[PDB]
Symmetry: D2
Subunit: 267 residues, 4 copies
């Protein structure tokens, strides 16, 4: 077991197509004892997570709720038991209002919506680290989900800006995490066919947006020297578990690219 | 004159130590007709800008004020004359509340403060582009002021995150600017001894923060193969004018490093 | 005149489609006094360069010839006159044997051929800097021609590896150049339809290789927010002149992208 | 066992201080069946490798020897047995003549020495890939040792250029490796006190060189949020083993930084 007898918090499960679900699944398969956090639809998330190989306590976490973050460490300690600490934390949380994405013009996205997006997608990685580092063991690992924003691309728009902010936050979280002997890193995943992506490809945020994202997917597999399967989140999940493990102990404030090596090729 | 006959909006003058003041000065020296935008203390800015080689109309622009941005293009056209468009736009605007910087711990920065900082420092570049692109000529140039946030550093904290977000926004503005035949680029300047900068070195955001920024400055000059004078904004100002000129016509969504080449050296 | 009164050595003119020819043309148009350097076919280069706006002394330089480099500074001083120094140096030199490029498998390139390519394309930038820095004025500029090798691509193969080596060498040349008050920078140009480029598209280095280069140049124009005209070297030439000028005085060991902003966009 | 049942070739053991020795050690600890390759001093290498947890066949490989590379796959197949293939390949090979490093001026390095350096340090990664990919299983992994050359630094000089070339080669090897279902990645390690490094700090390549490398070391630990122990190669070894494992299956043509996160921080 890669994560044998490691206590790992996993956020960001909403459906069985969620990357976080596949992270949670592979984590438990490798002997990790999980604490799950969920947002808004808790009855749904509890039902979805019942299909995981092992049962895991589910805590409510809205990263925009200061009370939720303030109480989180206590609620996690209650779930995993007194005198026990976290060895792992997975940030798999991302949102951007429709106005900040798709055929909705880049300039027409009002800041109130962008701010909400940056709050949930970027700042939330710092606030999660703050809440949970006090209850994290030395040799611990914090991992966030990233989408390479080094270059602008159609439709992703302000979500790309939010990911650029996240990458920057990760490098600062790493500074703080370092004091606790804890690593902080992002996995830059290739495109994964979640509900949200499938909807976007289906034209949910306008036709050209779906068209450009479908062209982006196809270009991604073409470029990737080992190919890229957008319907298979397992390679991403295994990469998150690699960073949660003891086998990247000199990597922090950094980004691991689980993208089939697409970002290393132009074509 | 590098910018002979070019009409250029220049934001972000507050004092004569402002990078924007030195941009404005060098721009006018090179035959540019300037429109100035100023925030909050207009009587002050009007007095400061009277020392510029040529007199320039000063417009009020708070980038957080929706009415100011909505009205901006009209007020600019009124100043430069009907049937006349801008050839240049300088974003020299930046702010992060005290909580987002210095010895004020990175995790203790409330999002309301970080959001206000990202609004003025990152989003404002997109909203300035939205307002002004409709009144910009083909072959035009938009330039923003950047501080390399590729790597985390002490004290700069959430301002670095704000700069990471700005870099991402610039790449998207470039996509929109391209339709108007306009270029969008950032100048990544080295540390410049502004009033706010001197205050920070003086320990205005805590002793440890001032100590770290002073060590960062000294390391910057050491690394820079052509040295770095933090008391000389002229090389930064000349670099902005180079991007405002017709002499970088194939560069857009990009970053020019006016840092003495410090970012290209480890030491 | 951007380069009025400046004495600039320009290498790498072989035909009138050469980037160096357009660099030389734009430089002379901006009041630069040129020293030209040519390889092997001197009669040809002399004839081609007669079409430049002004006549310029032509010196033989094979960068693989130690005597040519040893004697260079002397021969340049004789041409521009004793007591006069160079203000500018353009490295527009590039070669990789057929085996190092095209459908010729990457692994099948003999090192003897790769080494010849790296010698001419990468090391020669350091060689030219060594020979010429002693006869260069303070505030001077050395500029090399680059093709972004940050990501691998089809056909370019070992030429990409050579460009990666050049980028690295440039950063070290900048350290040495710094002592002389001289800047060292690369222009990362987009694809330009030179004789060799046209031949390669025509299938000169195999059909599949020509097909991939044609898809690369087409993808380049699409990505570029301000488009990319591969038949127009003028934007590249103007960018070199910008670096040779006094208007990027805080940029060294660095890379300016004259690529229509293609490298800042994914699509 | 992380590498349970995996057959892995490991090059670049010369002493027990070698990074390759620690890679080899940690690999065997994790259930890997090793083939070792050695250069020049074979009686020494056999003696050194006797201290490894398990007995491993040692094959002679000079990467500059065409006969050695042509015969390698056969000699490896003989060692691991007919109908058995490699699941892993470790390139831990690096050399640059004294003239290419230290206080020996950057410009004074003759290309013959630089070419020899680039041959062993960069090209050899492609040579090993060519020889060994035919006898490598799907889901296989090739790993090379890298020192981040993204920024120039004192003393490392042409070895940095060689590492820049290696990074570029890796991205091309990945394209070829991809056809065999094999990944190709570099581990960018922080400075490790090998016999060679200890000698350099001792002033073996001049006093100023040793002084700069000692300042680089100390700055590295300072910057690294989780610190950096240059006397501990285990974190580098564990990182190579992570890439050799099945736990980074979507990472190829890429670079993993085993540097304490030093490359993510400025200070
Ligand atoms: N799907 C892709 O193609 C892709 C690629 C790379 C990176 N990512 C990143 O992966 C992460 C996971 O997203 P996904 O693709 O699995 O989609 P998803 O919708 O399944 O996951 C997003 C999660 O964010 C949670 N969330 C939203 N707002 C929240 C809030 N205020 N507080 C707490 N949780 C909140 C949702 O409940 C959900 O569980 C995101 O950070 C996303 O940006 C996505
Ligand atoms: N000084 C440095 O060391 C340094 C280094 C690199 C980049 N920069 C960047 O240079 C730019 C200019 O800053 P500076 O260093 O000249 O300092 P400065 O204080 O002189 O300039 C900042 C400007 O931002 C303006 N501003 C603040 N809030 C605003 C708002 N809501 N609407 C409109 N304008 C607003 C201020 O009025 C001021 O004119 C900033 O973007 C800064 O981040 C600074
Ligand atoms: N054409 C493109 O698409 C493109 C794109 C970006 C960068 N570049 C770079 O621009 C530079 C100029 O090449 P180009 O595209 O104008 O083609 P070109 O063939 O016109 O220029 C190459 C030049 O190299 C010279 N040269 C070759 N071997 C030499 C040697 N041993 N000593 C001295 N000079 C030697 C040739 O004589 C010729 O003048 C090269 O470095 C090339 O890699 C080209
Ligand atoms: N030690 C560091 O500070 C450091 C940091 C990062 C990366 N690296 C890289 O790690 C790798 C291993 O080097 P090291 O630091 O363990 O030092 P080392 O001297 O122990 O290892 C170098 C190895 O290269 C081998 N070698 C030299 N020429 C060869 C040839 N022609 N054919 C085959 N093998 C040959 C030597 O026999 C030796 O085993 C190198 O690629 C090095 O650049 C070193
Ligand atoms: O967030 C991302 O990066 C993917 C966009 N999406 O489908 O939610
Ligand atoms: O804003 C910056 O990037 C630096 C100057 N400052 O205000 O601290
Ligand atoms: O060298 C280059 O980058 C392009 C010139 N060429 O070989 O076609
Ligand atoms: O090879 C390296 O990068 C480490 C320097 N050294 O001691 O050989």
């Amino acid at each position: 077991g890669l994560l044998d007898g490691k206590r790992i918090l996993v956020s960001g499960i909403i459906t069985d197509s969620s990357i976080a679900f596949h992270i949670a699944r592979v984590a438990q398969e490798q002997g990790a004892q999980l604490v799950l956090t969920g947002f808004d639809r808790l009855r749904l998330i509890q039902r979805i997570t019942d299909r995981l190989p092992a049962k895991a306590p589910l805590l409510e976490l809205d990263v925009q709720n200061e009370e939720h973050l303030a109480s989180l460490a206590g609620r996690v300690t209650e779930a995993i038991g007194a005198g026990n600490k976290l060895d792992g934390v997975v940030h798999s949380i991302g949102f951007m209002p429709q106005t900040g994405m798709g055929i909705n013009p880049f300039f027409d996205a009002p800041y109130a919506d962008v701010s909400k997006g940056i709050h949930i997608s970027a700042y939330s990685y710092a606030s999660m680290a703050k809440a949970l580092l006090p209850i994290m063991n030395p040799g611990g690992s914090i991992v966030g989900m990233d989408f390479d924003p080094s270059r602008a691309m159609p439709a992703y728009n302000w979500m790309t800006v939010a990911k650029s902010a996240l990458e920057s936050v990760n490098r600062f979280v790493a500074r703080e995490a370092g004091k606790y002997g804890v690593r902080s890193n992002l996995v830059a995943a290739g495109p994964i066919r979640t509900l949200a992506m499938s909807a976007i490809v289906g034209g949910a945020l306008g036709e050209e947006a779906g068209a450009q994202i479908q062209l982006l997917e196809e270009g991604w597999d073409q470029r990737a020297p080992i190919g890229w399967n957008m319907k298979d989140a397992t390679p991403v999940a295994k990469t998150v578990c690699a960073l949660l493990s003891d086998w990247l102990p000199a990597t922090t404030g950094d980004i691991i690219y689980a993208d089939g090596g697409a970002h290393t090729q132009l074509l």
